[PDB]
Amino acid sequence: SLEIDSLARFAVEEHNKKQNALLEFGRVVSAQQQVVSGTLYTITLEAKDGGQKKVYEAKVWEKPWLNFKELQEFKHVGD
Template structure:
């Protein structure tokens, strides 16, 4: 009987912990970045992504702002960002970018940049 009660308590505790743990805190899981408008680092990563894209594509895009984002903890952080940028005609366009960043090695890579 004691073993059964301990197993039940352990199961309930594991469930509560799983529900209470944000997805981003789980290694490999994607989690929503709250308040991307007010997150200076996320905005800087988005601006960097546009600049890096322009180096490759030479299409003259200009960074507007990051409007949505998710992060994934790996051996560093993957950012999946929704970005508004301005094209050469002055029109806003939305793009999706994935950026890998590892702060302790000062590494940043643009993994993808596509029109949304």
């Protein structure tokens, strides 16, 4: 499929540009697609780690009608 091949090449190029890398696209080996629905929560929370209180940002994709939850991002943003 031309569409998937184009998305795959986008991913590599975008990875390259973001990380300053030189990956050379080879080929798509398999691909799935799904309709996105539900809600994306961006949550700032405090938790203790390394002996001190730290602030993290989490992005959680959830679909209530399935009890589906996926952590899509989790980063330390402050203390």
